[PDB]
Structures are given as C-alpha cells and as structure tokens.
Design a protein around this ligand. Sequence first.
Ligand code: GDP
Ligand code: GDP
Ligand code: MG
Ligand code: MG
Lengths: 311, 160, 311
Amino acid sequence: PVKVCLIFAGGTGMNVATKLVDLGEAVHCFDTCDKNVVDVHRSVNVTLTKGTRGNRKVILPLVRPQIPALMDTIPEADFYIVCYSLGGGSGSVLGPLITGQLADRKASFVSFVVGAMESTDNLGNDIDTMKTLEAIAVNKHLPIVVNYVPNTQGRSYESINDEIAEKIRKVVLLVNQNHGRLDVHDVANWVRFTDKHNYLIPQVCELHIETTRKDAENVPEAISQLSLYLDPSKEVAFGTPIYRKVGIMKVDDLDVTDDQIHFVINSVGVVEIMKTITDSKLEMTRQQSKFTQRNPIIDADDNVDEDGMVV
Amino acid sequence: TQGRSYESINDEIAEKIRKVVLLVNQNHGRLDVHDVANWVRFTDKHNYLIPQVCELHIETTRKDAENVPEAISQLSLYLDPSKEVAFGTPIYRKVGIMKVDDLDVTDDQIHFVINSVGVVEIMKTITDSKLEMTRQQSKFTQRNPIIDADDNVDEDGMVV
Amino acid sequence: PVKVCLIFAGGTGMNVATKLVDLGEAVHCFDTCDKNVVDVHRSVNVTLTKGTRGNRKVILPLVRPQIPALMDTIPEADFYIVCYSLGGGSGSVLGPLITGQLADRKASFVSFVVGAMESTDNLGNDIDTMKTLEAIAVNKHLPIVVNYVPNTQGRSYESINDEIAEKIRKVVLLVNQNHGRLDVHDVANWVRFTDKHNYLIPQVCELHIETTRKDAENVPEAISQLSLYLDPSKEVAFGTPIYRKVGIMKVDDLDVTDDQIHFVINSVGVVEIMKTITDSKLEMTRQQSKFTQRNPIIDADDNVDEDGMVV
Ligand SMILES: Nc1nc2c(ncn2[C@@H]2O[C@H](COP(=O)(O)OP(=O)(O)O)[C@@H](O)[C@H]2O)c(=O)[nH]1
Ligand SMILES: Nc1nc2c(ncn2[C@@H]2O[C@H](COP(=O)(O)OP(=O)(O)O)[C@@H](O)[C@H]2O)c(=O)[nH]1
Ligand SMILES: [Mg+2]
Ligand SMILES: [Mg+2]
C-alpha cells in the first residue's frame, strides 16, 4: 500500500487538484466530462466516466454501475483524502460513492467538501449530499470525517481552493509516517474512532485543523484529537477528547510547515453549518419567491390549434 | 452564584469577616496570638507541608466542620466548654473558650477550618461554566464583506 | 478633558442638535453651508467649512484638508457622541472623517446615524457610508459602534429626530461619571472592547438602548453590555455578552429618566438592516427602471449645425 491516496471528484475537485499536481501518482481525479481538465493534470491520474457528457438524481444511475471500474484504478493505501463540492451534480455523486467503497475497504480517510452557495440548486444539493454522508456513516457504521468549507459570499473560488490545498498538505504531512511516536494504527484509530469506542455513534463529523493550542481547545465537544509538535517541550495534554495522540515532527522534514498542528474531530458543529445554509437560502428564496405573474394574454376566444398556433 | 444579588453576597462576606474579627480579638481562654499565627501560617512549624492557596471554611456546627475534606489546620471556638469535641483529622488543631459577656459572641461554636483540596473543583466549575457560555456565543459566522475590490477606497476608507 | 463632547454633522446633525442646545458648550456642529443653521444654534458651537457652498465624492476632496482645523476646535473629552445622516453628502463625509480622527485620539465614542430612504442617491450613500465606517473600524482596529435609525416610510423627520435626541440624552446620562461602581475606564472598555478582547474582530457594531431586561436580553449575539439601575435590588446578570458592567444611578440625579437602562453592543444585526435598504431600493428602482424611451424626433435628414440648431 502507498502512504496516502488523494481522490478528487467533479469540477471543484479537479480545480483543487491543479494545486497539488506535485504529488503526482498519488493523486486520482474523477469527473463525468472534461470541462475542468487542464494541461497540468497530465501529471496526475484522470478518469472520466462513460456516457455522461448539475442534477445528482440524473447522474447517479449513469455512474453507479461504473464505480467498481473506478475503484480498480485506486491503489490500496494506508490513508485516503477525498475532495469535492457538495453542491454540484458530479462531485457530489462520485465523491460519496467512492467514499462508500473506501468504507468497505475498512479504510482510514478524511474528506474536504465545499458548501456551494450560488443558488437554491447548490443549496439543495449541499443538503442532500450531507445527508448522503450521514446515511453512509450509519450504513457502514463508520465516522465520515469532513473538513467543511463554505463558499462565503465575496470570496473567490481561487482563495477557497488555495485554503483547501494547504489543509490537504497538512493532512499529507500528518500521515507521512515519519513522526516520532505516531503509528499507522494511531492514525487509523483517530479517524475510525468507533472501532474501539463502540459506545459512540458513527455519523458525519467535522475535521478541524488548527495551528495553535488555543484554537484547538476551542473546538466544541471534541471527540478525537491528534497533535503534531516540532518542539516536544511544547506538548500540552489539553482539551477533553475521548481519544488523544501526539506525534513529534522532525526539523529536517522539509514538509514541516508549522511548529504545531492539531487535527481535532467533533460532530456537534455540522448542525449550525447546515442551519446557516438553510436560513440563507430561505431568505434568498423569499425575495425571489414572493412573485405574482400576470393574467394570460390569450382568451378562450382565440382559435388555438394543437401546436398552439393562432392563425 | 447566578441569580444571587451582590448585596446578599456582600452581606454574607461581612458576617464572615466579623467572625474572624471575633476569632482574633485576643479575649478567648486558651487562645494565644501565637496559636492564631501557627494556625494560618501552618508551614512555619510543619515544614513537610507545601505552601499553596488554601481555603478557609467558617462553620457553626461540628457536623459541617467535620465535612471539610482533607482538613489541614483547625481552630474551634466554644461558648459552652462542655461541648468541646476533638473531631476531624487535621494536622494542627486548637481550641478557644469564648466569654458569655463578650458582646461580639454571635454563635455558640465557630470552627475555622483550612484545607486546600477544594480549590480545584471551584476553579473547574468556573472554567466549565465559562466554556459553555463561550461555546454558545463563540459558534458565530459573520457575513461576507459588503465592499468589493471594485470600490475605490482611499487611505481613510472613504468611498466617494 | 470634559465629560462628553457631542459632535453633529450635516443637515440632519444640525437638526438633531437644535433639540440639545441646553447642553451648550459641549455641543459642536459642522456643515458645509448654513442651510440648516437656525437661531437656537447660537447656544452651541457651529463651524462651517470653507469653499463648500449631496454628492460625497465631490465634497470629500474639498473638506478633507480642513479636518485638522476642525479637530482643533474639538476639546479632549472622556467620551464623544457623533451624529449625522448616512444618506446625504456633507454629514456622511464630515461625520466619518471626524470619527477617524477620534479613533486616532484612542477615544471612546458612539455614533447615532440615520438611514435615509428617499431616493437611490440616499440609499447609495447609506451603503457607501456604512462601508466607510467598516473600513475605518478595520484600519483603526477599533469597533465603530452606532445606533442605527432608519427613516421608516410615513414617519416624520421630526419624530425620528426626537427619538434620537432622547437616546443621546441617555448616553449623556450614562457617561456623566456620577454612578456607583461605574468608572471612566469601565465605559472605555465597554465600547473599545477589542482593546482587552484581542480575539474579537473590530467592525461596525450596533448600539441598542433598552429600558427593560426583556428587550435587552432579546439583542442577538450581544458582545458588550452596560446596565444602569436606580433600584439596586433589580440587578440581574442576564444575557451572554463577553463583557458586562453595571452602574447604580442616584435618585437625586435629576437626569435619571428611567429606572433601568441597558446599553447593549452587538454586530450580527447590521447585515439585515443593510439588506432591507438594498431590497427596498431594488424594488423601487425596478418600478422606475423598467422604462422605454421613444424614437428620436429628428432624422439624419435635418440639417443640424454644431450647436444643434435646425434652421
Ligand atoms: N470552492 C470552489 N467552489 C466551486 C468551484 N467551482 C464551482 N464551485 C461551486 O461549486 C458548485 C459545483 O460546481 P462543480 O464542483 O464544478 O460541480 P460538479 O462538477 O457537478 O461536481 C458550483 O455551482 C459553485 O457554486 C471551485 O473551484 N472552488
Ligand atoms: N431623520 C432625519 N432625516 C433627515 C433630516 N433631514 C434630511 N433627512 C434625510 O437625510 C438625507 C440627508 O440630508 P442631510 O443630513 O441634510 O444631508 P447633508 O447635509 O448633505 O449631510 C435627506 O435626503 C433625507 O432623506 C432630519 O432632520 N431627520
Ligand atoms: Mg462539472
Ligand atoms: Mg446639507
């Protein structure tokens, strides 16, 4: 198995992938067409589904039978990262289907998902995709751990994509197997926390990636925590998580970007996130909903034929 | 404590202060200035103990005083010397006999018990309480800026 | 320093000032002409800018170099109150410039600002002036705390001005330094809350001035709270603000108008306010926008000369 396999789906996933092409063979991209394929993608894996050239209900029956074929192109790995938009038609279908397959592999993985906010279609898709991940968490009895990134009004997709790529790199660093005290089994039991803590409920959880003790301590109701420290003198057993582990980073590890990084999983935060999306959409729809069309310009007097022709 | 007036709390504190003023009024049988000093400065003679923040508990029954956990140093005042009972397990213990003509004598017995294995919880309650409150106020999410890179903003932030 | 200095700008500010002339020397008025100067103003300070006899972009370059001169006429004070319309050309420029200068003094102050609603010009100005205050909050790293008063349809400017003057008096009372338990430093740390709470973001905040516990508790996401009580038995530590202080008013204080007054600062309320203005203007513009001029009454046949003369 490789150390980590990175999986990207849909346009948003393709776009984020462009920022991670230096990871090469470890990167696997999937989409239903080539609208988002650019030259830099030659450096990574790209697979497009057949017969599929925004509506998830339409895309699902077309792509479902192809999933096994997609999975054969994804090597066995010690950890996976999955990335896509919750709000489109392709990423939000391919992403969760592949995620279900990773759960069947008994894999350790996290996802980076975008809350798209443009339209009621985006918002509806966001809701259905979050519900999808919840259903998968239940059906596979496994936490589905996601770093949720909302497209906040006024912020460029470029900016958001940059932030996501930088977080993905921290996870790639986390799982690089080069830290003192930190095992592949330690990582597995961090993210698959219900395996050994059977009294906990598998569900959609959030991943919070923080670079200070203060920010990490402020994650509410933390369930499972992993901390990396460059200066082992700064290690402090803070917070109240059920599961906690620490790794010591190496100063000659060129990928070490920060002095300490905390990866905190909780789940009592997704609620609000969803509420904000529902409330925001409601307000927007209310302004556009409150409509009142005018009366028909044609009366029962006009002679209209079967094609609606009035001659 | 939530819901209690500062007036009420202040009244309670003043009444406790008066009991300490009474304690140290130097008019009690058997009780020295040195006895008081060695009660509160207990590490002076008990060098194996650790100086740290300790709590003072001021109780008017044997039962309440006995319920102070891990008592370190204890001073008891009694008006009725027949009621003196050497209770508890403190490291240091002293008794004074109050005088019935002492007009400041408010209670029949008063126990001043010092311990330190109680401050912890107190702090925890404050940290936990604040955390919960902050969590409700923290979980915030501001909206996007109402100004875009399109607007011409000058050094004072003026948009004309 | 004086206890409080009151600053009024533009026509609306001048108009509100007329109701506060009893405060005399403490009142300082500024405008670009004398259209709003009346006899009662003799009782207060009035300064008119030079060479300036509705368009903020036009007024700004004229008045900017004069600000230092205006500031020299404003005494050092322990607290300031600033008042102007967001929707005109003069108040909405002088007001924020002076506000910026007060921030440079490291001053404690609040503003009373009017949301003007007559026209798309008013509404555009309202938006740009709110954005101005936000930019100032950021640039000076200080909350810019305003009591926002919209000119609601059908309500007289007289009525609105009366309400503003009565609120200003409550703030004058608040900062009169005659209350038990309440310091000048307490007031400063209430309104300049980011000074000691560095994890908070300086931005435009609203000031809510309420005379019941119930109304004050209903301010959403309260940040910083100051309560005055005449009956100290009624003091209740309600709400969830980050900062809270109480003062006890004196029954022989002739300025004591109410039994309890709560001054609550939040910021998750300005949004809606702005939305209402944008939505309202949009609807109005839509009705006036949907226009369709007629064809030119002149054809390429007419002999038109350089001055457009057809002889
Ligand atoms: N953060 C981010 N959001 C995007 C990007 N592209 C599109 N979006 C948002 O995500 C939604 C789904 O787009 P996309 O991922 O291309 O859809 P899909 O190809 O059907 O999976 C769009 O409607 C946008 O709101 C991107 O590059 N970054
Ligand atoms: N509440 C209130 N609003 C006013 C008053 N006078 C004008 N307005 C509104 O505020 C806008 C700006 O007027 P004004 O303050 O005189 O403009 P400025 O002198 O250029 O600052 C007007 O277009 C009106 O909509 C007033 O006395 N009270
Ligand atoms: Mg697409
Ligand atoms: Mg004017």
